[model samples]
Target chain A: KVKKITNGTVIDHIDAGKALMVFKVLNVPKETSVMIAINVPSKKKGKKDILKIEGIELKKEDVDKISLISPDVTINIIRNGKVVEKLKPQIPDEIEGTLKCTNPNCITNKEKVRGKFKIESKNPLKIRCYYCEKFLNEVIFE
Target chain B: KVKKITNGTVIDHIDAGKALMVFKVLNVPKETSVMIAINVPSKKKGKKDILKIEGIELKKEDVDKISLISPDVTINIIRNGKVVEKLKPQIPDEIEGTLKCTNPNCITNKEKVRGKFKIESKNPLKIRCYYCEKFLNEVIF
Candidate 1:
């Protein structure tokens, strides 16, 4: 049985097979009660994932990144075993410095600058580097 | 239940009273079978809107603008009276030519140019002009 959290954030309905990527981006610090479940069955989505963290509430910035991983994710703020608020992350036009350009000749690959990209589309998850204008469809989460 | 389309798209879960905004952005040309439902009952959303188009499909570009208007929109593609693909539009970092800069002194206002802006954030729906770098929270669309 899954234990309920006293206070923290619960991210639910993450697409299946993406729990690992979500975990990587969350960057939960050591000593935090982080619980993750993958391949959980759902009525809306055949298979989904859930993430629960106790003692640490997620910020909007963190939620923004989470949307990039899965668009249909839902966030619930838990306090005293009661859900206080429910939110959904809206995908933004630009993702700054979280992903690396896949193009070998991209400027970010040659220089020490961080990666920045403009989201071309989300259906297939097309992203173009800001500097080199190279396209990367997948994220490495590093 | 809405009538099933042989082939087209069904856009659902639009926020109440925003179907007009979507219609303005869609700019659907004449000679298409379009169905619109406003103030429809939704279990998740108290009240919502639905738009169905037959014999026509929306491109990613069109879907992107719709996302700006309604974040939780659901797009369903029908083929042979069956839902084939489902998608949700994601907000873009920059919107080009879809809106006009409100700044009167901005270069786009003085010359013949389409507006281009960088999205600052979504909660406030803030945007900045690419030319004069003026910020606008509203779109002319």
Candidate 2:
């Protein structure tokens, strides 16, 4: 038996409010056929959401954009009616364009510009925000 | 004095390479302008960078997002060329959107997904990932 959606993109492993955020940002379709599940039970977390987007293709860049919003989100690209590529978590060596600097006095904020960050450590979840001179704990990016 | 912006983000106080990474994820314009200063002088400690995006309307959500990435990175929303919104940092009571339980086998990480985390501590940063009951210490996200 066909699992259904014989062809399309399946963006699994997304945090709550994240799927909707993706939907809104991607502007998937008010009319196009789509399947969305929120707070669904999972073998791993007990409950999580799984989204399957049919009849369309979500670009890698767009997937990158989603990764920005939520690091946990994973994107599976489907082409020719088959899963082709899976965009895993891109825990960047350093994050820049994805986030704006949080320091008010920092030149980036006061200046209206994108700030930069250095990935200090991934294991313990720590990074140094270059502009603010503060250690950014990665747990927040989850 | 007026700062020139041909078309890129001006990042200040960065350690080095960090500024470049910021521009990369942001996907800045190649032909645009960018000003980045690394290890700039600071009264607090070692160094810092200042980042500036020429034409971007930062929103409240953006500030919140920044806080998630780097609590120190502040967001100042400018309207009509004037500072309008100033966002400061306060350890959020709860983070709803993005935290995934570390354990791949954890229910949160599996088919079931609910990103909920409670701020266990601010200083030294501590959080409890609801699903796996995992303690996230010294968080960067």
State each model's CA lDDT, in order: 0.77, 0.55
lDDT: worst 10-residue window of model 2 chain B: B8-17
Complex DockQ, candidate 2:
0.01
Error of 1 at A65 (Å): 0.6
TM-score per candidate, in order? 0.48, 0.39
iRMSD values, candidates in order: 21.3, 24.4
lDDT tens digits by residue: candidate 1, B102-131 = 889988989998888898887656788999
Runs in model 1 lying further than 4 Å from the true structure: B1-141
lDDT of 1 at A68: 78
